[model samples]
Target chain A: SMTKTWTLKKHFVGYPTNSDFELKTSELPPLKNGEVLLEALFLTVDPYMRVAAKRLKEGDTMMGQQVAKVVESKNVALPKGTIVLASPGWTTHSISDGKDLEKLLTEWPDTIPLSLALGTVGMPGLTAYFGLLEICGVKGGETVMVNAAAGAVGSVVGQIAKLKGCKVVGAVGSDEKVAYLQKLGFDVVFNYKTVESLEETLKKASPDGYDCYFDNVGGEFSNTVIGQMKKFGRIAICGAISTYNRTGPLPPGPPPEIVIYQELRMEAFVVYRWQGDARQKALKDLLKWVLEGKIQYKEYIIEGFENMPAAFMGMLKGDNLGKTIVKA
Target chain B: SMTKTWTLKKHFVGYPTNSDFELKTSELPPLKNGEVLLEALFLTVDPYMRVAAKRLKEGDTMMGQQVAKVVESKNVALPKGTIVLASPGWTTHSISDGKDLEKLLTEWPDTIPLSLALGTVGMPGLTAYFGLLEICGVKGGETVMVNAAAGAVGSVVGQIAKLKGCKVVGAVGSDEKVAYLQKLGFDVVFNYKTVESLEETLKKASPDGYDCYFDNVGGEFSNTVIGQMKKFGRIAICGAISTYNRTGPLPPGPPPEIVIYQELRMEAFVVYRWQGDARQKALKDLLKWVLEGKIQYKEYIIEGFENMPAAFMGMLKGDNLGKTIVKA
Candidate 1:
C-alpha cells in the first residue's frame, strides 16, 4: 500500500512557513494481526501545533489529529469501513494496532462533516467546555470576556457561557467575525483590531468589570482585560498565539500585585486535562449540542492534504474564522 | 483618655522613612452607648500596609491591626478587662461600636502572650492557612516552595505545608532566616540573596520540579520558579514584596506560552476571600496547630507608639523575623 505523509523539513523559527514542511511518499507494509489500515479523510491545523512543533524533530511527520476510515482490518472490534479519530499526523494512510485511535461515537450523525472530529464536538470543543465550565467556573449573570471569540475554542466558549446565563463579551480580529459572533448570541462583540483603546472598549461593554476572562489571544490583549477583572475573578488561558511566532524567551507579564490585589485565578489548560467519566460526559454532551443545533460549528477547510502547511500558517495568521482544516 | 495615633503625613514613594509618618495626640470623648474604649496592647506592622496605604489619605491614621484591652466598655458583650483583636489603625486608644472587634477566645492561655493574636493566631496566620490549604491545594508528597519563608505568613505556610506531609522548600533573603526556617522542618532551605542562580538552586532542591508554589516574593524569582513547574502545577500568589516600593509602570513578566505548555494554575489571593464558617474553622485550626507546638512562631516586637513608623519601615526592609509587632 502507498502512503502520503507531510514531514517537518526544517524546524520552525518564529512564524512557520511552507519551507518548514515537506510532503513525502512511503510504501506501507501489509496489516499484521490486530492491525487496521486507515485512510485519512480530514486533517486539522490549530494554534497548538506552533508549540507542539518544537517537540517534533526535523524529518518528523507533522503532528496533528485526523479522521481516518478503516479500509482493511484484522482486529475483531475495528472492522472494515469503521471510522475513527486518530492522531496519525498529516498522513493519507496509516496502520494502527488500535491503541490511540478512538472510534467515533454512535450518536455522530452522518449529516455532520466528519472533519468536525478535529474541531467542534472534539478537542477544541472539549477545550472550551472544560476551560470555561471547570477552570473559569463561570456562574450565571457574570460577565465573560473571551478574545479570538470567532475561532474554534473561543466561539464555543462564548456560546456555552451564554447558555449558562452569562453575559459574554467577544473580541475578534475582524469586523466580519464581530458580526458573526454577535449573531451567535454574544452580548457584546467588538473588533479588537479596529478598536482605538482596548481598555475603554472593554469598559464600555461592561461598565463594572468582567468576572471571568477566557484568554485565547494572550499577550497585551490578555493583560488589558485582566486589569479590569472583578475581585476573585477567573481567567482561563487556553492559548497564546501572540507568543507562538515570537523568537527568544516569553515576554514579561503583569506584575503579581495585580493578581494578588484582585485575587484572580488564571489557569492555562488543554482539553486532555479532563478524563474518565467527566470527559466522556462532556464529549457526549458536545455531540448532543451539535445534533440538537444548540452548538453551531464553523470550519475553514482547505481542500487536499498537500495544503496542510498553508492551512496551519493561515490558522496562525488569523486568516480563518473557526478551525482551519485540510480535507484529504 | 489621651489617644496617640500615627498618621500618614506624606504618601510613600519608595522605601518609607520617618517623615512619611507623624505622631499626633488627641483627647478621646467619653464612651457612648454600645461603645467600648480600646487600649492598644500590641500593634502589627505588616507588608500589606504598603499597598493598603493607597486607600489612606495623607492625614488618615496608618492602616494596621492591634491586640487591645477593653478598659472602658459601654457594650455588655465586650465588658471591661476583656482582651480583643481589633483594627483600630495605628492608635493608642480607639472607641469602637464593637462592630469590627472580636473578643479573644477563652481557650487562650495566660502563659501565651495575648500579642500572639496579632501573629500566629490572627490575620497573617489565616493568610498563610487559606493560601496554602485552599489556593495551592497541596497534597501529600507534593513538593511545595514558599519564599519569605521566615516571615509572618511565609513561616506559617512552610510549617503548614510540612504538617500536610509535603516536601517543603523554602527561600529567604537572609541566611539567618534560612537557618531559622531550616529548624522549622522544611525539606530544603536556601538563601536566594546569595544563590548564584535561582533556577539552579530551585532545580537542585527538587529535580522533578515543584507541584505547588506559594509565592511571597514576586517578579524575577516567581518567573524563574514558574518556568520549572510541573504540569498541572498550582501557584498561590500570597504576596508581592518585590514590587512594594516600585514606581512607574510594572515590569513585564514571563510570556503565557510557559503557562500554557505546563498547564499551570497561578492564583493570587487575600485572606478575606475565604469567609463564613470555613474562615472560622481555619482560624481555629491555625490556633490549634500553634497551641500544639506543631507550628512554631517567632516575633520581632518594638516598644512604644512613637516607634510605630520605624517598626513598619524596618519590617518592610526585612530587618525582622516572623511577625513584626509594635508593643504599646
Candidate 2:
C-alpha cells in the first residue's frame, strides 16, 4: 500500500515558499504484530512548524499532529476502527507500533464534530488552557490581554479568560477577526493593524492595567501591551508567530525598565509542558466547555492531503481566523 | 535647631550633575509630643536614585535610606542614642514622629559596622536574599548568572547562590570588580566591558546554560545572557543599573523567542515586597552568615554629608565597588 507524505525539501530561508516542501508517495510496509495501520482524518497546520523549522534538516517529514482512524490493527488496545491522535507528521497514512497513539480518553459527544479532536479539544485547546490558567494564572476580575486573538490557541484563551471572569482584551490583524472576537464575548477587541498606537489603544481599553497577558504573537506588539501592565502582571509566552517566518535573528531584548519597575513576570511555555494529569484536566475542562456551548471554534480547512504546506504557510501569514486544518 | 538637606533642583537630564541638587539649611521646629530628633550617621547612595529622578519634583528632598541616631526623643519606643534605619532622604538631621522609623529587629553585632545597617545587612542584602531564594528558586548543583556582580545586591546574590551549592557566573564592569567577585568565590567572573561578546562569555562560563539568573543590570547584557538559559530557567529582575542613567526611552523588549522556546521565567521585584516572615527569614540568615564570616561586605564610603551628590553621581557611573555610602 502507498502513503502520501509531505517532507521538507529545504530549510525555509524567510517566509516559507512551496519549494521548501515536497509532497511524495512511499510504500507502507506490512504491519508487524503490534503495529497498526492508520488513515489520516485531520491534520493540524500550526505556527510551531515554522518556528521549529530551524531544528529540521532537509528530507525530514514536516512535523505535525493528526487525528487518524485505525484501518487495520493487531494491537488489542488500539483495535481497528478506533480513532487515535498521533504525531504522524504531514502524512495521509501511517503504520505505527501503537507507541505514539493516544486514545480519545473520553467519548466524543454527538453534538460536537470529531474534527474538533484536532482543534479545541486537542493541542490548541490544551495550549490555551495551560498557558492562560497555569502560566498566567488568570484570576477573577483581572484583565487579560491576548494577541493573535483570532487564532486557534488565542481564540480559546480569550474565551477561557472570559469564563474565568476576566475582562478580555483581544488583538487581531483584521477587522473581521476583531468583530468575530467581540461576538465571542470579548470585552474589548482591536484590529492591531489599524490601531494608531497599541499603547494608547491598550491604555484606553484597559485603563486600570492588564493583570494577565496571554501572548501568542510576540515582538513589538507584545512589547507595547506589556508597557501598560499593572504591578505584578503575568505574561504567558505561548508563541511568537510574528517572528516565526523571519530569516534574521530574533528581535532585541524586551524593555527592561518596565519589567523591573512594574515587577512583572513573563514566562514562556508549550502545551505539552503541562503533561500528565494537568493535560488531562485541561482536556477534560475544554471538552466540557465546548460541549456546554460555552466555547466555540473556527477552522480554515483545506481539503485533500497535498495542500498541507500551503495551509501551514497561510496560517503563519495570519490568513486563518482560527485553527488551520487539512482534511485528508 | 537647624537641619541640612539636599533638595532636587530639577529633574535629572542625563546623568545627575551637582547642579541637579542643592544643599540647604532649614529650621527644625520644636518637636511635637511624639516627634524624635535624628542625626544622620550614614546615608545610602544607590542606583535607584538615577531611575527615580523623573518622579521627583524640583523641591523634593532626594530619596534615600539613612542610618541615623536618635539624639533626642519624646517617643518612649525610640530613645536617645538608639540607631534606626529610615528613609530620611539626603539629610544631615530629621525630625520624625516615629511613624517612618523601622526598629532594628536584630541587634547590630559588634563585629559588623553600624554602617552595614545601610548596606550588606540591610536593604541590598535582603534584596539579594529573597530575589534569589524566592524569585529565582536557586537550588543546589544549578548554575547561576548575575550581572553587576560586585554591587551590593549582585555581590550578595553570587555569595548566596554559592552557599546554595550552585556554580556562580558573574559579570562586572571593571577588572577590580571581577577580581573581587572571584575572591568572593564566584566560579566564573568576566569584565563585561572587555569581553568580546557576552553570549560567548556566558557560553564559556555556563556551557550547560544558566538555571537561575539574578539580574541587576539589564539592557543588551541581559539580552545576551538570557539566550543561554536552560529550559525552565528563572530570572530575578532586581534592577537595571545599566540603564538607570539614560535620559532617553528604554531599550527594546527582551528576546521573546528564546524566552518562549526555552520555557524561561523572568520576574522583577522590590526587596520590600517580601516582607514579614520572608524578610525576617532573610535578615536572620543574612545576619547569621555575616556574623559567621560566611558573608563579607565592601563599602565605597565618601566622607562628609556635603559630598552626597558627588557620591550618588559616582555610584551611578559604576565607580563604587559594593555599597556606595555617605558618612556625615
Candidate 3:
C-alpha cells in the first residue's frame, strides 16, 4: 500500500520559505490491533506549526493538524467512516488508535457549516474565543483594541469582544481589511500602515485608553498598543508575527518597563494550555454563536495541498483577510 | 509668640532650582482648645516631596514631614515635651491634634531609634520594608536590584532584602555611596555612573535574573534592570530619582512589549497605602530587625532650619549617602 507525505527539504532560520518543504509518498506500517487508518481530508497550516518547526531541524515532516476520515478501523472506539480530528502533518493518510487523535464527528453545531471544524469550530476559532473572553476579559462598554484586526484570531476576537459589551477597535494591515473589520461591528477600524503615528493614532481612537489589548503582532505595533492601555489593563499576547521572520538576532524585544506606571497585566499563552477546559468550553459557545447567526467568520481558503507553503507564508506576511485555510 | 514658616517662593519646573523656597517668621495664633503647639525638631526631605512640589505653586510651604516636640498644649489630652511626627512642610512649628494622618505616629516603635521616625525606623524604612517583602515577596537567596542604593529608601531596601536572605545588588550614584551599601551587607554594589553596561553588569552579578526589582530610579535604569528579570518577576516602584534630576524631557523609557512577554508584575506603591494591616506587620518586623542589628541605617544631617531647602535639593540630586535630614 502506498502513502503520501511532505518532507521538509531545508530548515528555516527565521521564516519558512517555499524551498523548505517538499511533497513525497511512502509505504505505511501495519496497523496494530486497536489501530485505525485515517485518510487526510482537511489538513491545516497554523501559526503553532511554524513556531514548532523552529525548534526542530531539516528533513522532518513539517508539523500540522488535520480533520480526517476513518477508512478502516479495528478499534471499537473509532468505527470506519467516522470523522475525527488528528494532528497529522501535511499528509494524505495517518494511523491512529484514538489517542492524540481528537474525535470531531460528534453532534454538529446546528445551522453551522461543518468546515468550521477547521475554523470557528476548530483551532483558530477556539484560540480566538478562549484567548479573548477568557484571558483578556472584555467588560461591557469597555474598549478592546486588536492589533491584527483582519487575521484569524484577531477577527474572531474583535467580534467576541463586541458580543461581550465592548467598544471594539481593530487595527488591520490594509485599507480593505480595515473596511471589512468595520463592517463586522468593529466600532473603530483603521489601516495601521496609513496612520501617521501608531501611539497617537490608537490614543485618538481609544481616547479613554483601551481596557483590553489583544496583541497579534509583536515589535512596535505591540509596543504602541501597550502605550495606549489604561491603568490595570489586561493584555493577551497571542502571537508575534512581526518578529518571527527576523534573519539574525531577535532584536531585544520591546522592553516591559514602559507600562510600569500604567499597571498593566500581560501574559503569553498557547491555546493547548487551556485545551480540555477553556478551549472546549469556548468552542462550544463559539459554535452556538455561529449556529445562532450571532457570530461571523471569514475564510481565505487556498485551493489544493500543494499551495500550503504559500498559504502559510501569506498569512504570516498579512495577506489573509481572516483565518487563512487550505482546502484539499 | 513668633511662628517660623518656610514658604514656597516659586514653582519648580524640573529639578528644583535653589530659588524655589523662602523662609519667613510670623506671629502665631493662640492655641485653640482642640489643638497642641508643636515645635519642629527634625524635618525629612524625600523623593516624593520633589514630585509633589512640581504640582505646588510659588508661596506654598514645601512638601515635608517632621518629627516635632509638643512644647505646649491647649487641649487637655495633649501635654508638653511630647515629641510627635508632623508634616507641616518645611516649618519650625506646626499646630495639630492628629485628627487624620495616614502614617500617624500612633505610638513609638520600641528599640527603633526615635529619629528613625525620620529615617529608616520611619517612612523610608517602612517604604523599603513593605514595598520589597509584601509587593515583591523577596525570597531567601533571591537577587534584588535596587537603584539609588545608599539613599533613605534604597539603603534600607538593600539591607532588608539582605535580612530576608536575598542577594542585594545596589546601584548608587557615587563610589562612596557604593561603599556605604557594601557596609550595609549589599552582596554586590555598583556605581551607576561608572558601570559600563547596566544590563551586562547586572547580568554578570545576578545571572539567574532579578526575582524582585525595587526601582528607586526610573528611566533607563528601570529599563535595564527589568531586562534582567526572571519570568513573573515582581517590581516595586517606590520612586524614580533618575527622572527627578533631569531638567528637561527625560529620554523615552523602556520598550513596552517586554512587560507583556516577561509576565512581569510592576506595581507603584506609597508607604501610606499599606497603612492598616500590611504596614503594621512590616513596621513591627522591621523594628525587630533594627533592634537585633539585622538592619543598619545611615543618615546625612544638615544642621539648622535655614539649610532645609539646600538639604532637600541635595538629597534630590543624589548627594546624600543615606537619609537626608535637617535639624533645628
Candidate 4:
C-alpha cells in the first residue's frame, strides 16, 4: 500500500518553511504480528515540533502526534476499525507495533468532536492540565497570568485557572484572540502587540501581583510578567514560542534578583512528567468539566494532508487561535 | 554611661560611604525591669546589610548582628558578664529587654573562637546549611557549584557540600580567594574576574554538569552557571552580592529556557525560613562538625567600632576573605 508522508527535506534554518518539508509517497509493508496499519485522522502542529526540528536530520519523518484509524491489524489489542491516538509522525498511513497506540474513548462524548482527540483531549490539553495544577499549583482567590494565552496549551491554561476561581489575566498576540479569551470568561485579556509596554500592562492587569504564572512564552514577555509576581509566587515554564524560530542563543531576560526578593518558585514541566495516576485523573476531570460546560476548547483546523508543513509554519507565526491541527 | 552608635546619616547611594553613617555617642538610660545592657563585642558586615539599606531611612541605625557581652543586667535570666548573640545594629552598647539575645555556649568550644557566633556558627553558616541541605538537597557524589565562594555564606556552602562527599566547584572574585577556597577543600576554584570565559571555565571544571548550585552572586555569573546544570538540577539563591550595589534597574541575565530544558528547580530562600526544630538540628550538626575538625571556618576581622562603614564598603568591593566582622 502507498502512504503519503511529509519528510524533512533539510534542517530548518530560521522559521520553518514549506520547502523544509517535502510531501512524498512511500510504500507501506504488510503489518507483522502485533503490528497494525493506521490511517491518519487528525495531525497536530505544535511549538514542540519546531523545537524537535533542531534535533531532527534531513529525510526524517517530521515528528508529530496524530489521531488515527486502524485500517488493518495483526495485533489482538488494536482491532481493525478502532480509532487510536499515535505519534507516527506526519504521515497518512503508518505501521505501528501497538505500543504507541492509545485507544480512544469507548463511548466518546457526543458533545465534542473526535478531532479533539488530537487536541483538547490529547497532548495540548494534558500539558495545560499538569503545568497549571501540578506545577503552578493554582488556587482560588489567586491571580494568574498566562502568556501565549490564545494558543493551544495556553488557552486551556487560562480557562483552568479561571475555573479555579483565580483572577485570570492572559496575554495574546492579537486583538481577536484577546476578545475571544475574554468571552471564555478570562478576567482580563490584553493584546501583547497592542500594548505600549508589557510591564505597564501587566502591572495594570495584576495591580496587587500574580500569585501564579502559567508561562507558555518564555522570553522578555514572561520576564516582565515575573516582575509583578507576589512573594512566594509560582511560575510554570511550559513553552518558549517566541524564541522557537530563533537559530542562535536565546536573548537575556530579567535578572534573577527579582526571584530572590520575591522568593518565587519557578518550575518547568513537560506533560509526560505526570503520566500515570495524574494523567488519568486530569483527563477524567477535564472530560467531566467539558460535559458540564465548565471547560471550552477551540481548534484551528487546516484541511488536507499535504498542507501539514504550512499549517505548522502558520501556527508558529501565530496564525492559529487555539490548538492548531490539520485533518488528513 | 555613653554608648557609641553608628547611625545612618543618609540612605546609601550605590556603594556605601563613610558619610552615609555617623558615629555618634548617646547617653544610655537606666535599664527598666527585665532589661539587660549589652556591650557589642563583634559586629557583622554582610551583603544583606546592603540590601537592608534600601529599606532603611536616613536616621535608622545600620542593620546588623553582633556578638555581645552583657556588662550589667536587671534580669537574673541574663547575668552580668554573659556572652550572647544579638542584632543590636552597629552599636557599641545596647539595652535589651532580655529578649533579642541568644545565650552563647556555656563552656564554649575552646577550639573555636566566640566571635564565630556572629560568623560561621551563626546566621551565615545557618544560611549555607539550610540553603544547601534543605533547598538544594545536596547529596553525596553530586557536583555542586557555589558563587561568591569567598564570602560568608558561599564559603560555608562549599565546605558543607565537600563534607557531604560532593565535588564542589566555586567562583571567587580574586586569586587570593581562589587559594583560600582551595585550602578549604573545594574541588575547583576559579577567579571569575580573571577567567577568559566563565562558560568555558565551568565546562572544564564540571564537565559532567552541576547537580546543586548555591548562588550568592547572581548576575551573568549565575546565568552562565545555570546553563551548565544537569537535569533536575537544584539552585538555592541565597544572595545576589554582585548586584547589591546597583543603583539602577538590574541588568538582564540568561533566559529561563535553560531551566525548562534541564528541568531545573530554582528556589530563593533566607536562612530564617527554617527556624525552630530545623534550625536547631542544623546548628547541632554544624557545631559537631566544627568540633570534630570536619569543618573549618575563616574570618576577616576589622578592628574598632568606628571602622564599620569602611569594613562594610570593603566587603562589598570583594576585599574580605571570609566573614567580614568589625570588632567593637
Candidate 5:
C-alpha cells in the first residue's frame, strides 16, 4: 500500500521555506513480530517542530506525533481495529511495540472533546501545564503575562492560571487572537502588533507588576515583560517562535540587568525534562480540569495529511490561534 | 579630636565623572552606652558605590564599608585600640553598636590578604562566592565563563571555578586584564576589545559550550554569552557595568528566543538573598579557603579619604585591577 510521508529535504536557514521539506510515497514493509501497523487519523503541528527539526539530518522522515488507528496488529497490546492516540510524527502508517505510547486509553476521560487529546489534553496541554504550574509556580491573586496567548500552550496556560486563581494577561499578534484569548477567559488580552510598546501596554494593564511570566514569542517580548516584572518574579519559558526560522546564528542573549534588578527567576524548559515524573502530574491535573469543563481547547486544524507541512509552517509563523493540527 | 567624614555632594552619571562626590571632616559625637568609637583605616571604594550612589539623594554619604580601629569605647566590656571592620560608608569616623559587622580579625587566618575583607574577602568576594557556587552551581569538568575577568568578583570567580575543577574562561576589556586573568590560572582569557566577534571567540574557547556563566558586565556581553550556552546551562547575574550609566532605556530587548532554545537557567542575585543562611554557609567555606592560601587577592588602593570621589570615579571607569579601595 502506498503511504505518504514528509521528508526533510534540507536544513532551514531562517524561516523554513517549503523547499526545506519534500513529500514522498513509499510502500510499507510487512509488519514483523510484535509490530502493530497504525493508520494516521490526526496529526499535530506545533511551532516547536521548526525549532526542533534542526536536530534531524536531510532526507529523514519529519518528526511528529499523530492519533492513529491500529489497522493490523501482530502485537498483543495493540489489537486490530483498536483506536489509539499516537504520535508517529507526520506519516500515514507507523509500526511500534506500543511501549512509551503514553497510555491515554486507561486514563482517557469521557465527555471531553477528543480533539483536546491533540491539544490541551495532549502534548501542548502537558507543556503548558508543567511550564506554568511547575516552572512559573503560578500563585493565587498574582498576574501572569504570556505571549502567543492564543497559541496551543499559551491558551491552556492562561486558563490553568485562571483556575489556579491568577489574573492572566495575554499577548498575541492579531486582533483575532486577542479576541480568542478574551473568550478563553483571560483577564486582559492585547494585540501586540497594535500596541505601541510592550512595556507601556503591560504597565498600563498591570500597574503593580507581573508576578509570573509564561513566554512563547521571545526576543523583545520577554525583555519588555522582564521590565514590567515585580521583584522576585518567576518566568516559565516555553517557546520562542520568533527566532526559530532565522537563517543565521541565534540572536544575542537576554538583558542581564533585568535578572538582577528585579531579582527574577527565569528558566527555559523542554517537556522531556519533566516527562520523567512531572509529566504525569501535569497530565493528571490537566485531564481533571478538562473533564470538569474548567479548561477548553480550540484546534486550528488543516484537513488531510498532505497539508501537514503547511500546518507546521503556519504554527511557526504564529498563524494559528490554538493547537495546529492535521486531519488524515 | 576632630573626626573626618565624607559626604555625597551630588549624584553621578556615566562612570562617575568629576564632581560626583565630596569628602568632609567633622568632629564625631561622643559614643553613647554600648557604642564604640571607630577610626577609618582601610576604606573600600567599589563599583557598587558608583551605582548605588546614583540611587541616593544628594548630601547622603556615599555607600561603603571599611576596616577601622576602635579607640575609646564607652561600654566597659569593649576595650579601646581594638581593630574592627564596618560598612560605615565613606566616612573617616563612625560610632556604632557593631550591628551587621563581620569581625575580620577573628575571621582572618593571615594566610591571605586582609584587604580581601573588602574585595574577595568582602562583598565582591561574597558576590562571586554565592553567585557562582550557589546560584550557578558549578560542576567539575564543566566550562565556566566569566565576564569582567579582571574585576574583583570576576577574578575570584575564575579562580573559584578552577578550584571546583571546571575549565574557566574569562573575557575582559583589555589585553592587560586578559593577562591578569591568565596569571590567576584562567584556562582561556581574551581581550574582548580585540575580538571582532564574541561568538567566534566563545566558540573557540568553549567548544563544549559553557555550563556555567557569571555575568558582571551586562548589555552585549550577557546577550552574546547566553546565545552560545549549552542546554541546561546556568547563568548567575551579579552586575551590569556595561549599561550602568546608559542614557536611554535599553534599545528594546535582544534575541530572547535563545532563552527557550537553550533551556537556560538564569537568576539575578544580590548576595543579600542568601544573607541570613546561604551567606553564612558561603562565608565559612570562603574563609576556610582563604586560611588555607587557596585564594589570593589584590588591592588597588588610592591613598587619602579626600580622594574618595577620584577613586570612585576611576573604579567606575574600570580603573581598578582587583578590588578598588581608599587607604585612609
Candidate 6:
C-alpha cells in the first residue's frame, strides 16, 4: 500500500508557512503478527501541534493524533473496519502494533460524528475538563472567565462551569466568537479586539471580580484578566496559543503582589496528567452532555488531506470560529 | 493609665520615611464587663506591615500583630497574667473585649520564649508551614527552593522541607544568611546579590530543577527562580518584599506557555486560611520541630516601642537577619 505523509520541512520561527511542510508518498511496510494497517479519518490541528513542534526536527513526520480506521490487519483481534484513535502523525496510512491506539467509547451514538472524538470527546475536550475542574477548581455561586471561550476546549470549559452553577464570562477576538459562546449560555462575553480598554470591560462584566480564570492565550492579555481576579481566586493555564507565533522576547511574569493580594492559585497542566478512571469519568460526562443537548460544539472542517498546511496556518491566523478539523 | 501609640502621619510613597509616623500618648479607656487591658510584649514588623499599609489611612495607628500580656481584666475568661496574640496595631497598651485575641497554646512552655509566639511559633512561622506544606503541596524526596532563605518565614520553610526529607535550595541577599541556612541543613544556598547570574547559580544548585518554590520577595528575582522549575513543579507566594518598595509601574504576569510546558502549579495564600484543627496542627508541628532541634529560628529585636517606625523601615531595607520584633 502507498501512504502520503506530511513532514516538517523546516523549524518554524515566527509562524509556519507552506514551505515549512514537505509532503511525499511512501510504500508502507507489510503488517506482521499483532499489527494493523490504519487509514487517517478525521484529523485535528490545534495550539497543541504548534507547541509540541518545539521539540521537533525538520526531517521528521509532523506529529499529530487522528481518528483512524483499520484497513487491513494480520491480527484477528483488530481485523479490518475497526475504528480507533491513534497518533501516527500527519499521514494518510500507517501500520501500528495496536499498543498505542485507544478505542473509542463503546456506547458512542451514530448520531454523533466521530470527528468529535478528535475535538470535544478527545484531548481538547479533556483539556477543558481536567484544567477547569481539577486545576481551576471552580465552585458554585462563583464567576468564571474563559480566554478563547468559543474555541473547542473553551466551549466545553464554559458549559461545564455553567453546569456547575457558576456565572460564566468570556473574552474573544471577534463578535462572532462572542455570539457563539453567548448562544452556548455564557452569561458574559465581549469581542476583546473592539474594546477600547480590555481591563475596563472585564471590570464592568463582574465588578466583584472573577473567581476562576481559564487561560488559553498567554502574553499581555493574561495579566489583564489576572488584574480583575477576586480574593482566593483560581487560575488554570491550559494553552498559550498566541505566544507560539511570537518571535520577540517573552514578557516578564505578572507582579507577584497582584496574586498575593488576591491570595490566588494559578496552575498549568496538560491533558495526559489524568489516566484510567479519571480520564474516563470526564469523557463519559462530555459524551453524555453532547447527547443530551446540554453541551454545544462547533467545528470548522476542511475536506481532503492536502489542505493540512493551510488549515493549520488558518488556525494560526484565527480564521476559524471553533475546533479546526481536516477530513482525510 | 497612659498608653503610647504610633500612628501613620502620611501614606508611604515608596519606602517609608520616619516623618510619615507620629507617636502619641493616650489614656486607656475604662474596662467594661468583657474588656481586658493588655500590654505589648513582642510586636513584629514584617513584609506583612508594608503590604498591609496599602489600605491604611493617614490617621490610623500603624497596623501590626503582637504577643501581649493582660495585666488587668474585667472579663472572667481572660484573667491577669494571661498572654495572647492580638492585632491591635502599633501600641504599648490597648483594651479589647476578648473577641479578636487568639490565646497562645495553653501548653506553651516557659522554655520557649514568649517572643517566639510573634516569630517562629506564630504568623511568620505559620506562613511558612501552610505555604510550603499546604499550598506548595511538596512531596518527600522532591527539591524545594526558598527565596529570602534566611528570613523568618524562609528559615522555617527550608527547615520544614529538609525535615520532610526533601532537597532544599535557597537564595538570599547576604553571606551571613547563606551561612545560617547552611548550618540549619539546607542542601544548597547562595547569596543572590553577589551572584554573577542568579539563574546560573540556581541551576547549579539543583541541576535537575526545583519541585517547589516558596517565594517571599517577588519581582524580577522570582522569574529567575521560576526559570529552573522542574516539570509539574509547585510555587507558593507568601510575600513580595522587593515588590513593596517598587515606585514604578507594576510588572506583567509570566508567560502562560512556560508554566503549561512544565505542567506547573503556582499558588499564593495567607496563613489565616487554616483555622481550628488545621491551624493548630501546623503550630504543633512547628513547635515540635523547634523543641526537637529540627527547626531553628533567629530574631532581630529592637529595644522599645518608641522605635517602631525605624524598626519597620529597617526590615523594609533588609537589615534584619531574621524576624524583626519590638520588645516593648
Instruction: Assess every candidate by TM-score.
Output: 0.93, 0.93, 0.76, 0.90, 0.85, 0.90
Candidate 6 CAPRI assessment class: medium
Highest DockQ: which candidate?
A: 1
RMSD of each: 2.6, 2.4, 5.3, 3.1, 4.0, 3.0
lDDT of 4 by residue, B1-328 (tens): 7898888898777898877889888999998999998998888888888887778877888888888889999999989998888897889999999767788655467778888887778888899998999889877899999888888888888889888899999988999888888888899999989999999999999899999899888877778888999988888888888777877766555555567778888888877777787787778787888887777888888899878899989989987777888877
lDDT (10s digit) by residue, model 6, range A1-328: 9999999999898899999999999998888899999999988888778877878888888899999999998877787999999998999999999999988998988998999999988888899999888888876898999988888888899898889999999888888898788888999999988999998999899999998999888777887888888898888888878788888767655666677878888888889889999899889999998998888888899999999999999988888898899998
Point out the worst 10-residue segment of candidate 2 chain A by lDDT. Answer: A246-255
Give per-residue CA lDDT, model 5, range A1-328, as digits (tens).
5688898999887777789889888898888898888888878887777766878989888888877788988988778887777766678987777773644646785666556777887788888888887789876888998888888888888899899899889888899888777877998999888888778889889999899999877766666788888898998888777767766654434555556767888898877677555666777788888778788877787888878888887877777766787888
User: DockQ order of candidates, best first?
Assistant: 1, 2, 6, 4, 5, 3
lDDT of 1 by residue, B246-325 (tens): 87555557657788879998888888777878878887898889888888988887988888888888898888776788
- Return the interface RMSD of model 5: 4.0
Higher-ranked by lDDT: 2 or 4: 2
lDDT of 2 by residue, A1-328 (tens): 8999999899887889999899889999998899999999989888788867778889989888898999999998888899989897889999999988788867567677677888899888998988888889876999999888998888999899889998999999998898899889999999989889888889999999889998887877777877899999998889888877766766645676677878998888877777888788788999889878789887787898878888888877788776788888
In candidate 5, how many clashes are counted? Answer: 10
| Per-residue lDDT value at B24 in model 2 | 91
For candidate 1, give the lDDT of residue A84.
Answer: 94
- Worst 10-residue stretch by lDDT in candidate 3 chain B? B100-109
Fnat for model 1 comes to 0.83
Q: List the residue pairs that clash in candidate 3.
A: A255-B255, A256-B259, B8-B59, B8-B60
Clashing pairs in 1: A252-B252, A252-B253, A253-B253
Off by over 4 Å in 4: A7-14, A17-34, A139-141, A195-208, A246-252, B1-37, B72-76, B105-107, B194-197, B204-206, B246-252
lDDT of each: 0.87, 0.86, 0.76, 0.84, 0.79, 0.87
Q: Write the per-residue lDDT of candidate 2 for residues B221-268, one digit (tens) a residue.
A: 788877899999999998887777767766655666678778998899
